[PDB]
PDB file of C-alpha atoms in Angstrom:
ATOM      1  CA  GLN A   1      -0.636  -0.142  -0.202  1.00 21.58           C
ATOM      2  CA  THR A   2       2.939   2.358   0.325  1.00 22.56           C
ATOM      3  CA  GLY A   3       7.087   1.944  -0.308  1.00 25.40           C
ATOM      4  CA  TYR A   4       6.053  -0.169  -3.414  1.00 26.85           C
ATOM      5  CA  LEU A   5       4.707  -0.453  -7.062  1.00 25.24           C
ATOM      6  CA  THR A   6       3.344  -3.029  -8.281  1.00 23.14           C
ATOM      7  CA  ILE A   7       2.859  -2.821 -11.995  1.00 23.18           C
ATOM      8  CA  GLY A   8       2.273  -6.107 -14.843  1.00 24.60           C
ATOM      9  CA  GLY A   9       2.125  -8.370 -10.872  1.00 23.70           C
ATOM     10  CA  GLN A  10       5.975  -7.922 -10.408  1.00 26.37           C
ATOM     11  CA  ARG A  11       6.553  -5.362  -7.613  1.00 28.03           C
ATOM     12  CA  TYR A  12       9.252  -3.682  -6.565  1.00 29.62           C
ATOM     13  CA  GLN A  13      10.227  -1.542  -3.751  1.00 34.92           C
ATOM     14  CA  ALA A  14      10.573   2.436  -4.655  1.00 31.91           C
ATOM     15  CA  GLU A  15      11.424   5.944  -3.238  1.00 28.79           C
ATOM     16  CA  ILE A  16      10.144   8.626  -4.878  1.00 31.72           C
ATOM     17  CA  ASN A  17      13.304   9.862  -6.310  1.00 30.19           C
ATOM     18  CA  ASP A  18      13.951   6.539  -7.813  1.00 29.60           C
ATOM     19  CA  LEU A  19      10.857   8.363 -10.375  1.00 28.40           C
ATOM     20  CA  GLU A  20      11.928  11.242 -12.979  1.00 26.27           C
ATOM     21  CA  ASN A  21       9.381  13.347 -13.563  1.00 27.53           C
ATOM     22  CA  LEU A  22       7.843  13.805 -16.849  1.00 25.82           C
ATOM     23  CA  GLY A  23       6.241  17.252 -16.894  1.00 28.63           C
ATOM     24  CA  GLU A  24       2.962  18.248 -15.774  1.00 30.53           C
ATOM     25  CA  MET A  25      -0.405  16.485 -17.036  1.00 30.21           C
ATOM     26  CA  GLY A  26      -4.188  17.064 -17.236  1.00 30.54           C
ATOM     27  CA  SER A  27      -6.350  14.118 -16.051  1.00 30.95           C
ATOM     28  CA  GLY A  28      -8.897  15.225 -13.682  1.00 29.64           C
ATOM     29  CA  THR A  29      -9.277  19.287 -13.046  1.00 28.94           C
ATOM     30  CA  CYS A  30      -7.377  20.832  -9.498  1.00 26.78           C
ATOM     31  CA  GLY A  31      -4.179  18.860  -7.830  1.00 25.39           C
ATOM     32  CA  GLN A  32      -1.110  18.073  -9.574  1.00 24.98           C
ATOM     33  CA  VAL A  33      -0.630  15.313 -11.616  1.00 26.97           C
ATOM     34  CA  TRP A  34       2.363  14.211 -12.879  1.00 25.48           C
ATOM     35  CA  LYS A  35       3.558  11.999 -16.295  1.00 26.38           C
ATOM     36  CA  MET A  36       6.478  10.132 -13.794  1.00 32.23           C
ATOM     37  CA  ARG A  37       9.557   6.928 -15.513  1.00 36.10           C
ATOM     38  CA  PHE A  38      10.140   4.228 -13.127  1.00 36.25           C
ATOM     39  CA  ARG A  39      13.840   3.810 -13.401  1.00 36.67           C
ATOM     40  CA  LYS A  40      14.387   0.255 -11.996  1.00 36.10           C
ATOM     41  CA  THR A  41      11.960  -0.652 -14.916  1.00 37.00           C
ATOM     42  CA  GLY A  42      11.236   2.114 -17.681  1.00 39.22           C
ATOM     43  CA  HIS A  43       7.171   2.469 -17.188  1.00 40.69           C
ATOM     44  CA  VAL A  44       5.640   5.183 -17.018  1.00 41.21           C
ATOM     45  CA  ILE A  45       3.232   6.025 -15.154  1.00 40.53           C
ATOM     46  CA  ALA A  46       0.820   8.710 -13.029  1.00 37.69           C
ATOM     47  CA  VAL A  47       2.219  10.321 -10.243  1.00 38.80           C
ATOM     48  CA  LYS A  48      -0.668  12.282  -8.122  1.00 39.31           C
ATOM     49  CA  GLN A  49       1.520  15.057  -5.513  1.00 39.61           C
ATOM     50  CA  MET A  50      -1.111  15.473  -2.080  1.00 38.55           C
ATOM     51  CA  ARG A  51       0.724  18.251  -0.137  1.00 38.33           C
ATOM     52  CA  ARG A  52       0.599  17.810   3.327  1.00 40.72           C
ATOM     53  CA  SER A  53       0.383  21.924   3.315  1.00 41.25           C
ATOM     54  CA  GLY A  54      -2.243  21.166   1.096  1.00 42.20           C
ATOM     55  CA  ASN A  55      -6.178  22.478   0.420  1.00 37.86           C
ATOM     56  CA  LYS A  56      -7.924  20.629   3.449  1.00 39.41           C
ATOM     57  CA  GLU A  57     -10.714  19.767   1.441  1.00 41.88           C
ATOM     58  CA  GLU A  58      -8.925  18.415  -2.014  1.00 39.21           C
ATOM     59  CA  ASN A  59      -7.224  16.834   0.555  1.00 39.92           C
ATOM     60  CA  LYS A  60     -10.403  15.142   1.737  1.00 36.97           C
ATOM     61  CA  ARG A  61     -11.521  14.536  -1.851  1.00 40.10           C
ATOM     62  CA  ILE A  62      -7.743  12.909  -3.109  1.00 42.33           C
ATOM     63  CA  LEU A  63      -8.096  10.505   0.020  1.00 40.04           C
ATOM     64  CA  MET A  64     -11.958   9.449  -0.619  1.00 41.91           C
ATOM     65  CA  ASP A  65     -11.528   9.064  -4.296  1.00 45.45           C
ATOM     66  CA  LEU A  66      -8.101   6.855  -3.363  1.00 41.79           C
ATOM     67  CA  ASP A  67      -9.641   4.828  -1.050  1.00 42.37           C
ATOM     68  CA  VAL A  68     -12.372   3.964  -3.710  1.00 43.72           C
ATOM     69  CA  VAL A  69      -9.863   2.933  -6.386  1.00 44.89           C
ATOM     70  CA  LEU A  70      -7.213   1.200  -3.766  1.00 43.00           C
ATOM     71  CA  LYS A  71     -10.735  -1.239  -2.746  1.00 38.38           C
ATOM     72  CA  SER A  72     -11.660  -1.504  -7.327  1.00 38.88           C
ATOM     73  CA  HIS A  73      -8.645  -3.173  -7.624  1.00 39.69           C
ATOM     74  CA  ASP A  74     -10.534  -6.355  -9.300  1.00 38.62           C
ATOM     75  CA  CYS A  75     -12.661  -3.871 -11.642  1.00 38.27           C
ATOM     76  CA  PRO A  76     -11.346  -3.975 -15.031  1.00 39.41           C
ATOM     77  CA  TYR A  77     -12.616  -1.182 -16.112  1.00 39.75           C
ATOM     78  CA  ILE A  78     -11.838   1.162 -12.816  1.00 40.15           C
ATOM     79  CA  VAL A  79      -7.927   3.082 -13.505  1.00 41.86           C
ATOM     80  CA  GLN A  80      -5.410   1.166 -10.673  1.00 45.34           C
ATOM     81  CA  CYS A  81      -3.323   2.505  -8.329  1.00 45.62           C
ATOM     82  CA  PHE A  82      -0.133   1.367  -8.646  1.00 46.45           C
ATOM     83  CA  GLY A  83       1.180   2.011  -4.742  1.00 45.03           C
ATOM     84  CA  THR A  84       1.900   5.015  -2.873  1.00 41.88           C
ATOM     85  CA  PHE A  85       4.916   6.716  -1.347  1.00 41.84           C
ATOM     86  CA  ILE A  86       4.452   8.673   1.824  1.00 42.20           C
ATOM     87  CA  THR A  87       7.149  11.040   3.079  1.00 41.58           C
ATOM     88  CA  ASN A  88       7.037  13.890   5.775  1.00 41.94           C
ATOM     89  CA  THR A  89       5.413  16.611   3.077  1.00 45.50           C
ATOM     90  CA  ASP A  90       3.942  14.884   0.586  1.00 43.34           C
ATOM     91  CA  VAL A  91       1.752  11.575  -0.542  1.00 41.70           C
ATOM     92  CA  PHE A  92       2.716  10.495  -3.942  1.00 40.18           C
ATOM     93  CA  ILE A  93      -0.302   8.135  -5.362  1.00 42.45           C
ATOM     94  CA  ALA A  94       0.404   6.296  -8.221  1.00 43.97           C
ATOM     95  CA  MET A  95      -1.881   5.339 -10.998  1.00 47.17           C
ATOM     96  CA  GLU A  96      -2.750   3.732 -13.896  1.00 49.16           C
ATOM     97  CA  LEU A  97      -1.332   5.824 -16.833  1.00 49.38           C
ATOM     98  CA  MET A  98      -3.827   6.129 -19.443  1.00 48.98           C
ATOM     99  CA  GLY A  99      -3.788   8.158 -22.776  1.00 49.67           C
ATOM    100  CA  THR A 100      -6.254  10.686 -22.724  1.00 51.32           C
ATOM    101  CA  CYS A 101      -9.995  11.727 -21.726  1.00 47.27           C
ATOM    102  CA  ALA A 102     -13.401  11.413 -24.081  1.00 49.95           C
ATOM    103  CA  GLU A 103     -13.388  15.349 -23.624  1.00 48.05           C
ATOM    104  CA  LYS A 104     -10.198  15.650 -25.582  1.00 48.61           C
ATOM    105  CA  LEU A 105     -10.726  12.881 -27.674  1.00 48.18           C
ATOM    106  CA  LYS A 106     -13.698  14.789 -29.018  1.00 49.34           C
ATOM    107  CA  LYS A 107     -12.031  18.100 -29.387  1.00 48.35           C
ATOM    108  CA  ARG A 108      -9.208  16.343 -31.635  1.00 46.41           C
ATOM    109  CA  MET A 109     -11.602  15.059 -33.113  1.00 47.50           C
ATOM    110  CA  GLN A 110     -13.360  18.192 -33.841  1.00 45.70           C
ATOM    111  CA  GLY A 111     -16.509  15.917 -34.759  1.00 46.90           C
ATOM    112  CA  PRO A 112     -18.150  12.920 -34.115  1.00 50.01           C
ATOM    113  CA  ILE A 113     -17.091   9.659 -32.757  1.00 50.81           C
ATOM    114  CA  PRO A 114     -17.940   6.067 -34.021  1.00 48.63           C
ATOM    115  CA  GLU A 115     -20.672   4.481 -32.706  1.00 46.95           C
ATOM    116  CA  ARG A 116     -18.387   1.087 -32.553  1.00 50.34           C
ATOM    117  CA  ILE A 117     -16.178   3.161 -30.497  1.00 51.10           C
ATOM    118  CA  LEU A 118     -19.284   4.247 -28.019  1.00 54.89           C
ATOM    119  CA  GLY A 119     -20.277   0.895 -27.744  1.00 55.83           C
ATOM    120  CA  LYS A 120     -16.759  -0.436 -26.662  1.00 52.17           C
ATOM    121  CA  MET A 121     -17.111   2.893 -24.265  1.00 51.48           C
ATOM    122  CA  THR A 122     -20.784   2.600 -23.152  1.00 53.31           C
ATOM    123  CA  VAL A 123     -19.802  -1.374 -21.732  1.00 50.48           C
ATOM    124  CA  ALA A 124     -16.819  -0.462 -19.409  1.00 52.45           C
ATOM    125  CA  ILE A 125     -18.562   3.103 -18.096  1.00 51.82           C
ATOM    126  CA  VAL A 126     -21.751   0.680 -17.289  1.00 50.88           C
ATOM    127  CA  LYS A 127     -19.820  -2.002 -16.096  1.00 53.06           C
ATOM    128  CA  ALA A 128     -17.564   0.376 -14.190  1.00 51.28           C
ATOM    129  CA  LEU A 129     -20.751   2.136 -12.022  1.00 50.60           C
ATOM    130  CA  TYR A 130     -22.487  -0.904 -11.382  1.00 52.17           C
ATOM    131  CA  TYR A 131     -19.453  -2.516 -10.069  1.00 56.52           C
ATOM    132  CA  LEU A 132     -19.224   1.406  -7.947  1.00 54.06           C
ATOM    133  CA  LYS A 133     -22.829   0.725  -6.767  1.00 53.25           C
ATOM    134  CA  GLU A 134     -22.994  -3.034  -6.094  1.00 54.02           C
ATOM    135  CA  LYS A 135     -19.720  -3.451  -4.051  1.00 54.21           C
ATOM    136  CA  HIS A 136     -19.237  -0.699  -2.719  1.00 56.93           C
ATOM    137  CA  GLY A 137     -22.381   1.269  -2.146  1.00 58.62           C
ATOM    138  CA  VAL A 138     -20.831   4.346  -4.733  1.00 60.28           C
ATOM    139  CA  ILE A 139     -23.235   6.562  -6.641  1.00 59.93           C
ATOM    140  CA  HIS A 140     -20.795   8.454  -9.256  1.00 58.39           C
ATOM    141  CA  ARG A 141     -22.538  11.303  -9.248  1.00 55.11           C
ATOM    142  CA  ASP A 142     -20.746  13.017 -11.853  1.00 54.25           C
ATOM    143  CA  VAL A 143     -21.030  10.696 -15.242  1.00 55.53           C
ATOM    144  CA  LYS A 144     -19.247  13.179 -18.257  1.00 51.78           C
ATOM    145  CA  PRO A 145     -16.499  12.544 -21.061  1.00 50.31           C
ATOM    146  CA  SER A 146     -13.654  14.258 -18.534  1.00 50.85           C
ATOM    147  CA  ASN A 147     -14.032  11.085 -16.518  1.00 51.86           C
ATOM    148  CA  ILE A 148     -13.878   8.405 -19.364  1.00 51.72           C
ATOM    149  CA  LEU A 149     -10.237   7.175 -20.240  1.00 56.68           C
ATOM    150  CA  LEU A 150      -8.628   5.778 -23.008  1.00 56.91           C
ATOM    151  CA  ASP A 151      -5.636   4.776 -24.147  1.00 56.68           C
ATOM    152  CA  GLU A 152      -3.430   3.499 -26.719  1.00 57.52           C
ATOM    153  CA  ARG A 153      -4.393  -0.721 -25.893  1.00 55.31           C
ATOM    154  CA  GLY A 154      -7.614   0.405 -25.941  1.00 57.37           C
ATOM    155  CA  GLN A 155      -9.004   0.365 -22.740  1.00 60.18           C
ATOM    156  CA  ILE A 156     -11.841   2.260 -21.944  1.00 60.11           C
ATOM    157  CA  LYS A 157     -11.853   3.228 -17.645  1.00 59.82           C
ATOM    158  CA  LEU A 158     -13.480   5.136 -15.683  1.00 60.49           C
ATOM    159  CA  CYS A 159     -11.221   8.094 -13.920  1.00 63.09           C
ATOM    160  CA  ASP A 160     -10.222   8.112 -10.233  1.00 66.27           C
ATOM    161  CA  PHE A 161     -11.176  12.140  -9.558  1.00 66.24           C
ATOM    162  CA  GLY A 162     -14.652  11.916  -8.097  1.00 71.19           C
ATOM    163  CA  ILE A 163     -14.715   8.230  -8.132  1.00 71.28           C
ATOM    164  CA  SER A 164     -16.018   8.069  -4.169  1.00 69.21           C
ATOM    165  CA  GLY A 165     -19.323  10.186  -5.629  1.00 69.37           C
ATOM    166  CA  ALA A 166     -24.804  21.615 -14.094  1.00 66.58           C
ATOM    167  CA  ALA A 167     -25.027  20.184 -17.392  1.00 68.02           C
ATOM    168  CA  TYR A 168     -25.667  16.113 -17.157  1.00 68.39           C
ATOM    169  CA  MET A 169     -27.978  16.213 -13.869  1.00 68.51           C
ATOM    170  CA  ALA A 170     -30.752  14.067 -14.011  1.00 69.78           C
ATOM    171  CA  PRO A 171     -34.733  15.765 -13.731  1.00 62.49           C
ATOM    172  CA  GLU A 172     -35.101  14.242 -10.137  1.00 62.47           C
ATOM    173  CA  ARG A 173     -31.948  15.545  -8.977  1.00 65.12           C
ATOM    174  CA  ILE A 174     -32.614  18.908 -10.221  1.00 62.76           C
ATOM    175  CA  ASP A 175     -35.994  18.871  -8.367  1.00 65.41           C
ATOM    176  CA  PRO A 176     -36.596  15.377  -6.755  1.00 67.47           C
ATOM    177  CA  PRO A 177     -40.457  14.662  -5.767  1.00 69.28           C
ATOM    178  CA  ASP A 178     -30.897   6.754  -7.404  1.00 69.25           C
ATOM    179  CA  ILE A 179     -28.378   5.671  -9.639  1.00 65.95           C
ATOM    180  CA  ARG A 180     -30.789   6.556 -12.555  1.00 65.77           C
ATOM    181  CA  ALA A 181     -29.245  10.241 -12.209  1.00 65.49           C
ATOM    182  CA  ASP A 182     -25.913   8.821 -13.631  1.00 63.45           C
ATOM    183  CA  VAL A 183     -27.623   7.033 -15.538  1.00 61.91           C
ATOM    184  CA  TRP A 184     -29.202  10.110 -17.150  1.00 60.97           C
ATOM    185  CA  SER A 185     -25.806  11.411 -17.937  1.00 61.64           C
ATOM    186  CA  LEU A 186     -24.157   8.898 -19.159  1.00 61.03           C
ATOM    187  CA  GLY A 187     -27.343   9.609 -21.834  1.00 61.69           C
ATOM    188  CA  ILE A 188     -26.565  12.961 -22.190  1.00 62.47           C
ATOM    189  CA  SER A 189     -22.422  12.359 -22.556  1.00 61.86           C
ATOM    190  CA  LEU A 190     -23.043   9.390 -25.606  1.00 61.82           C
ATOM    191  CA  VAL A 191     -25.302  12.498 -27.337  1.00 61.25           C
ATOM    192  CA  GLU A 192     -22.541  14.668 -27.282  1.00 62.99           C
ATOM    193  CA  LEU A 193     -20.165  12.588 -28.398  1.00 61.39           C
ATOM    194  CA  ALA A 194     -22.173  10.358 -31.298  1.00 59.35           C
ATOM    195  CA  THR A 195     -22.767  14.190 -32.300  1.00 57.13           C
ATOM    196  CA  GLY A 196     -19.241  15.986 -31.289  1.00 56.00           C
ATOM    197  CA  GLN A 197     -22.546  18.331 -29.809  1.00 50.70           C
ATOM    198  CA  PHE A 198     -23.113  19.230 -26.717  1.00 50.46           C
ATOM    199  CA  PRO A 199     -26.964  18.925 -26.195  1.00 50.57           C
ATOM    200  CA  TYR A 200     -27.081  22.688 -24.230  1.00 50.59           C
ATOM    201  CA  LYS A 201     -24.464  24.223 -25.743  1.00 53.86           C
ATOM    202  CA  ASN A 202     -26.444  27.106 -26.660  1.00 53.09           C
ATOM    203  CA  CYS A 203     -27.089  27.956 -23.209  1.00 53.89           C
ATOM    204  CA  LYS A 204     -25.479  30.809 -20.737  1.00 53.54           C
ATOM    205  CA  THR A 205     -25.897  30.263 -17.515  1.00 56.02           C
ATOM    206  CA  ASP A 206     -26.423  26.339 -15.299  1.00 54.20           C
ATOM    207  CA  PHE A 207     -29.676  27.576 -14.233  1.00 52.80           C
ATOM    208  CA  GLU A 208     -30.653  27.578 -18.594  1.00 53.11           C
ATOM    209  CA  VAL A 209     -29.588  24.188 -18.256  1.00 54.63           C
ATOM    210  CA  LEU A 210     -31.267  22.950 -15.686  1.00 51.45           C
ATOM    211  CA  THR A 211     -34.954  24.576 -17.127  1.00 53.13           C
ATOM    212  CA  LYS A 212     -33.932  22.762 -20.808  1.00 50.61           C
ATOM    213  CA  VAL A 213     -33.906  19.850 -18.832  1.00 50.71           C
ATOM    214  CA  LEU A 214     -36.729  20.391 -17.331  1.00 52.23           C
ATOM    215  CA  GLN A 215     -38.934  22.014 -20.054  1.00 52.39           C
ATOM    216  CA  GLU A 216     -37.253  21.142 -23.136  1.00 52.66           C
ATOM    217  CA  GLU A 217     -38.172  16.873 -24.243  1.00 55.54           C
ATOM    218  CA  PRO A 218     -35.296  14.493 -24.043  1.00 57.79           C
ATOM    219  CA  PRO A 219     -32.500  15.575 -26.235  1.00 57.65           C
ATOM    220  CA  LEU A 220     -32.110  12.017 -28.884  1.00 59.12           C
ATOM    221  CA  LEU A 221     -29.847  10.652 -31.014  1.00 58.57           C
ATOM    222  CA  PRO A 222     -30.303  11.981 -34.992  1.00 57.40           C
ATOM    223  CA  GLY A 223     -32.222   9.741 -37.038  1.00 57.48           C
ATOM    224  CA  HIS A 224     -29.953  10.724 -40.017  1.00 60.05           C
ATOM    225  CA  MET A 225     -26.536   9.779 -38.983  1.00 60.59           C
ATOM    226  CA  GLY A 226     -26.687   6.125 -39.540  1.00 61.11           C
ATOM    227  CA  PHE A 227     -26.731   4.591 -35.757  1.00 60.78           C
ATOM    228  CA  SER A 228     -28.042   1.498 -35.083  1.00 61.80           C
ATOM    229  CA  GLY A 229     -31.760   1.081 -33.793  1.00 62.18           C
ATOM    230  CA  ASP A 230     -29.954  -0.406 -31.072  1.00 64.01           C
ATOM    231  CA  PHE A 231     -28.141   3.046 -29.934  1.00 67.13           C
ATOM    232  CA  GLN A 232     -30.797   4.860 -29.953  1.00 68.80           C
ATOM    233  CA  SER A 233     -32.855   2.771 -27.936  1.00 66.90           C
ATOM    234  CA  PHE A 234     -30.061   2.414 -25.376  1.00 64.80           C
ATOM    235  CA  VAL A 235     -29.706   6.888 -25.338  1.00 62.58           C
ATOM    236  CA  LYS A 236     -33.675   6.875 -25.589  1.00 61.77           C
ATOM    237  CA  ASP A 237     -33.627   4.392 -22.665  1.00 61.64           C
ATOM    238  CA  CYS A 238     -31.128   6.282 -20.591  1.00 60.40           C
ATOM    239  CA  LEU A 239     -32.429  10.151 -21.112  1.00 62.97           C
ATOM    240  CA  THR A 240     -36.383   8.541 -19.427  1.00 59.94           C
ATOM    241  CA  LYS A 241     -37.228  12.297 -17.642  1.00 58.55           C
ATOM    242  CA  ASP A 242     -39.709  10.497 -15.611  1.00 57.95           C
ATOM    243  CA  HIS A 243     -36.661   9.155 -13.206  1.00 59.16           C
ATOM    244  CA  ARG A 244     -39.081   6.367 -11.559  1.00 60.85           C
ATOM    245  CA  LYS A 245     -39.331   4.733 -15.493  1.00 61.01           C
ATOM    246  CA  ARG A 246     -35.416   5.268 -16.113  1.00 61.37           C
ATOM    247  CA  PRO A 247     -33.892   2.465 -15.852  1.00 63.09           C
ATOM    248  CA  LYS A 248     -30.911   0.936 -13.603  1.00 65.79           C
ATOM    249  CA  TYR A 249     -27.904  -0.156 -14.627  1.00 64.72           C
ATOM    250  CA  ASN A 250     -29.271  -3.552 -14.284  1.00 66.56           C
ATOM    251  CA  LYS A 251     -31.595  -3.322 -16.660  1.00 65.52           C
ATOM    252  CA  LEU A 252     -29.524  -1.375 -19.318  1.00 65.11           C
ATOM    253  CA  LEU A 253     -26.667  -4.079 -19.046  1.00 66.09           C
ATOM    254  CA  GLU A 254     -28.917  -6.336 -20.461  1.00 66.74           C
ATOM    255  CA  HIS A 255     -29.867  -3.765 -23.204  1.00 67.29           C
ATOM    256  CA  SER A 256     -29.072  -5.104 -26.966  1.00 68.69           C
ATOM    257  CA  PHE A 257     -26.464  -2.601 -27.209  1.00 69.57           C
ATOM    258  CA  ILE A 258     -24.663  -3.644 -24.368  1.00 70.20           C
ATOM    259  CA  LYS A 259     -25.270  -7.164 -25.832  1.00 68.91           C
ATOM    260  CA  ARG A 260     -23.871  -5.942 -29.283  1.00 68.60           C
ATOM    261  CA  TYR A 261     -20.288  -4.206 -28.222  1.00 68.23           C
ATOM    262  CA  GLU A 262     -20.008  -7.246 -25.256  1.00 71.95           C
ATOM    263  CA  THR A 263     -19.335  -9.798 -28.301  1.00 73.48           C
ATOM    264  CA  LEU A 264     -18.274  -7.522 -31.485  1.00 70.35           C
ATOM    265  CA  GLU A 265     -14.582  -6.903 -31.827  1.00 71.76           C
ATOM    266  CA  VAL A 266     -13.749  -3.333 -32.650  1.00 75.57           C
ATOM    267  CA  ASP A 267      -9.900  -1.724 -32.831  1.00 74.16           C
ATOM    268  CA  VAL A 268     -10.417   0.718 -30.100  1.00 74.76           C
ATOM    269  CA  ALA A 269      -6.685   0.986 -30.243  1.00 74.28           C
ATOM    270  CA  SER A 270      -6.222   1.523 -33.758  1.00 77.32           C
ATOM    271  CA  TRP A 271      -8.548   4.041 -34.049  1.00 77.89           C
ATOM    272  CA  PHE A 272      -7.203   5.718 -31.109  1.00 76.74           C
ATOM    273  CA  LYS A 273      -3.588   5.454 -32.284  1.00 74.69           C
ATOM    274  CA  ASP A 274      -5.013   7.195 -35.408  1.00 70.39           C
ATOM    275  CA  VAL A 275      -6.550   9.770 -33.561  1.00 68.13           C
ATOM    276  CA  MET A 276      -3.377  10.582 -31.555  1.00 69.51           C
ATOM    277  CA  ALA A 277      -1.630  10.612 -34.613  1.00 69.41           C
ATOM    278  CA  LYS A 278      -3.671  13.027 -36.754  1.00 67.01           C
ATOM    279  CA  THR A 279      -4.072  15.325 -34.300  1.00 68.02           C
ATOM    280  CA  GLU A 280      -2.470  18.624 -32.594  1.00 68.01           C
TER     281      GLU A 280
END
């Protein structure tokens, strides 16, 4: 749990001077997150630095999130912790280095992300959220493209940032008369990524977004982009306005969209490399 890195299944003693700092990196929002090279093996990892003298509530958050991450070692869809180093002034948390988050993917692409990618993503994220709920009684409560991470190897994982639970908020979360509010948020994320357009990008304030969520028809995938009936149905189901009728993860895992992408081979890795190459 401290003074070791465990990578691949090989365990190595380690201190922080065994890592070369390769510079900062933006995965999450606040904090400090370094890309670092482990000298003994040449593995490149992410390292969160939590300063002892840091903001009490940033620190609290970091620790609740790590708590969940450490308990989630058996979930393949959540980013893994390799170990920690504790000094008199810092905690360094060694994490799986991912390539990028889906929000930056979207910005790089400057357009729609294909259905087949979104299918693999949906499988992974719904399984992560379900795992969290069932095993740790965690409701994630902030599903959005910036929390969805992809790598060069085609892996998709839920990010550690706020994993211990404005614009992705469910109608019952805005105005309650449930893990199903996360489901709404997933819905909005899939429409945004599938179309390359956030469905409330013309709102100027958080509250205006809220009013759109409650007053307007749910945004649905467009009918003229060649999406499957399955994907259209899945999104429609996620964006059920009445939360009492909106499916749970358990129900969503039986959806024909999920079954198709549990099965189908999709080369996410090559697609991802192509995007990261062709872009700044």
